Design a protein around this ligand. Structure first.
Ligand code: NA
Ligand code: NA
Lengths: 511, 496
């Protein structure tokens, strides 16, 4: 006889979870882009599907914008900056409107979390308590900068000019029109990170959400209108990176491009920007190390290592994807991390029991599993996990690989999924060499309670953010961004505000 | 026969070499390029013509000096002390540096001494004082999603690392100082590539850097062509930052090379800066201001006031006066104290500048002053004022980088704003007026990185300088440049 195989899948007896009425209404109605004063379809009429990654089904459709639509959005943002009421708005007007928007996000937080969970796949509880809460706080925090942007008054020596009578100062002007392109891993939160500093400084914005996760950005557009922002201050265009995204990057009428994504796509974006002398901020790839010193509590360290990689299914630019653990405690820590990994509840994001959702798309599952297979092919072994899971969602097991070396693809390359590589080290100099042995430099963490060792180590790790006894932890007051091939520029804090302004020096001879 | 210091003569006579790590060296190829005195077209020196091999060696040295030498563990006060010593050494040898600069670049020696050299010294002194005053921030993190948080969070400012610096020929020593000083203050190391037309003052500065006591490899100086040595520096993945001043076109090429390695970049590029004259001005003061704004340094200034827009009520009187000033300026060798206008830097520059003038005539512009060729040795061009120009003409749209003004009337300030901003550039601009209300209404409307009032192209080490629009991005000088030679590292400790 011939072998006959049946993959056990019952979508039919699969459990369902209640949604708010508002969430259902938003999903049911026709979706459009926000272009100037109008909600609009694409000129072509084309649309793209929005897929729930828990079950592979289509939940919505959004416009598929081409260059024509992007050019219209840019034209609107230009007009709003060059001539509308936004141009003459008081600092206090911008502050007020942003504060209203932060409250509106909070008032509609569960709905936004459900939309985000359905579209992106992440656990709804995490979307609500982290993503949506911090999106709101980002608008509130930046609102307060709107009234506090200060230039400098300079006492110029003018050493070559006798009896000089010079009055000299700097002004911080909005950079202008900002094109913002964001990834799919934190759709609402990343939208907030790009839009909020723009609004606070008096910029206008064309936002291109990721093709895989357009919905929360569209709902945020509704809240922006409800908050009272003038038309064209925020415009939102949906579509493919290779068409809509690229067109935004090449438009000579933007003044700044703000991009988060892969290093490869970031370079493409930057080369387009440069040809127009467009300013650029680039938050790019990572392969962030987690260094565990031998003085740690083993359970705390293991929970820390597990969280550092598996948070948001490893779909985090600063995911702690390489663990270097001192040889005195390596076996105990890794044994514990594997047990944690195998215990994580895998399921749909709308189930409150779920700790690990699906990946965002089939393409992402294909990439991630391809990396895992590559590791096996080079001699790595799985202490936990290792496959794709059957069924129509895009699920992958939390995976921990050991017996890896620095030469392997899984160690060198960003996987962007729930895959850890873990290796021992015998001394701190070696841990430093291993940790910096990457083209990237986005994040890193150190796990220890040893003051001397921590302070000797922090300066030696080439990363934009170094955490101690935590990882991928955010606050609106603390800037975030890359060194090395992880890009340049900073999100959040006072820093981002300065990066959405252009400094004008003024020097008056009043003699 | 204008006299030179003995020291200047000795410097000119001896073999010139590049500074590469702990060695002064010739190029691996053995090639050299000529240094020409633009007042007479004669060769006064020869310097090495570096290729990629020599640039790679300089980058390797700078890397070693940042990654492992004494410079890595130097105290903030060590960097401060050495920079202050260097500033005094520049001042102690100021006349010699001025003579070298005048012979190599062509500018009046008195201006080289009183402006370029003095301000190069002051740049090192000013930036020395930043070395002990670079501060990160301590952040009180809300952590609103984390109850009872115990988070200690701050930023560190680290040196960006190894800096490649490529500079133009128009202010050779001063631009070297601008790129090198902030690097030293922050703890960076530097590979400097001076312009092929003006290598000499940079090489002499190298000697002063050594004499000041900087560790080997902290500053390296490679001479040669932009297309070879410059390009090699820009593409080296072992630099962390590229700092470039030059044309917008070359700036883009440099930036594309940088980007492929995710090298940070600062770019100070082209300009076509407008000078706006309001109708309340003193006519003589305005005319003298318009003339200085364009003819300073023979118009070889990125922020040269190359377009004058003068209110129609006073246009005729201001331009009459400007043309008289232009025709009166003393043209001659830079070493002559009577000289007000030196030659341009090279024959190729003169060809370019005269070609622009010719182009203007071809499109219907007329010369109120100058225009006519200067016979004889040296690369001399007359101070030139063109009128009857329009915004469509090449001379109005394109950077000429010589002593050529275009001047046009306007009837109202809205029009002056439209005209002034009708350029791809945005480096500088000036307004001439004593009318407080008009000035303050206008300053915000002009899209330029520096707006001067009743002056133009005036510099101070405390006031940042740089471009908007196609004039680049990033800033030189001030507190701003210091921050641009650091990389910020956020640190967040959970001490619970
Ligand atoms: Na989706
Ligand atoms: Na020369």
């Amino acid at each position: 006889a011939h072998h006959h195989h049946h993959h056990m899948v019952n979508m039919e007896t699969n459990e369902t979870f209640a949604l708010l009425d508002a969430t259902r209404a938003f999903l049911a109605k026709p979706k459009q882009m926000l272009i100037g004063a109008e909600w609009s379809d694409a000129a072509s009429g084309r649309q793209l599907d929005v897929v729930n990654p828990a079950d592979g089904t289509v939940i919505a459709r959004v416009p598929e914008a081409d260059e024509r639509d992007v050019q219209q959005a840019v034209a609107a943002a230009r007009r709003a900056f060059d001539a509308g009421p936004w141009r003459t708005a008081k600092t206090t007007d911008r502050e007020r409107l942003m504060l209203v928007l932060a409250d509106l996000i909070e008032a509609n937080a569960r709905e936004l979390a459900e939309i985000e969970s359905l579209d992106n796949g992440k656990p709804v509880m995490v979307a609500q308590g982290l993503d949506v809460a911090m999106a709101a706080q980002c608008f509130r925090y930046m609102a307060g900068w709107a009234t506090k942007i200060e230039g400098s008054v300079i006492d110029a020596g003018m050493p070559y000019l006798p009896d000089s009578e010079i009055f000299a100062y700097t002004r911080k002007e909005p950079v202008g029109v900002v094109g913002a392109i964001i990834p799919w891993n934190f759709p609402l939160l990343m939208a907030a990170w790009k839009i909020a500093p723009a609004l606070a400084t008096g910029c206008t914005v064309v936002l291109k959400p990721a093709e895989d996760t357009p919905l929360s950005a569209l709902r945020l557009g509704e809240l922006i209108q409800a908050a009272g922002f003038p038309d064209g201050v925020v415009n939102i265009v949906t579509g493919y990176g290779h068409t809509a995204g690229a067109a935004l990057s090449r438009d000579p009428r933007i003044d700044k491009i703000a991009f988060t994504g892969s290093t490869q796509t970031g370079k493409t974006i930057g080369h387009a920007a440069l040809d127009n002398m467009t300013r650029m901020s680039l938050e790019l790839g990572g392969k962030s190390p987690v260094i565990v010193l031998p003085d740690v509590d083993l359970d705390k360290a293991a929970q820390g290592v597990a969280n550092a990689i598996f948070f948001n299914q490893g779909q985090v630019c600063t995911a702690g994807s390489r663990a270097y653990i001192h040889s005195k405690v390596f076996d105990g820590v890794i044994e514990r991390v594997a047990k944690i990994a195998a215990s994580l509840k895998i399921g749909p994001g709308m189930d409150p029991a779920t700790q690990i959702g699906p990946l965002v798309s089939a393409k992402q599952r294909e990439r991630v599993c391809g990396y895992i297979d590559s590791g096996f092919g080079e001699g790595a072994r799985a202490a936990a996990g290792g496959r794709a899971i059957d069924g129509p969602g895009f699920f992958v097991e939390p995976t921990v690989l050991v017996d890896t070396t620095q030469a392997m693809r899984v160690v060198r390359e960003e996987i962007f999924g729930p895959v850890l590589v873990a290796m021992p080290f015998d001394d701190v100099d070696t841990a430093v060499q291993l940790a910096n042995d990457t083209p990237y430099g986005l994040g890193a963490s150190i796990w220890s309670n040893d003051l001397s060792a921590i302070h000797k180590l922090v300066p030696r790790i080439a990363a934009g953010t170094v955490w101690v006894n935590c990882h991928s932890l955010l606050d609106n007051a603390l800037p975030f961004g890359g060194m090395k091939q992880s890009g340049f520029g900073r999100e959040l804090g006072r820093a981002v505000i300065d990066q959405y302004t252009e400094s004008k020096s003024v020097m008056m001879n009043y003699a």
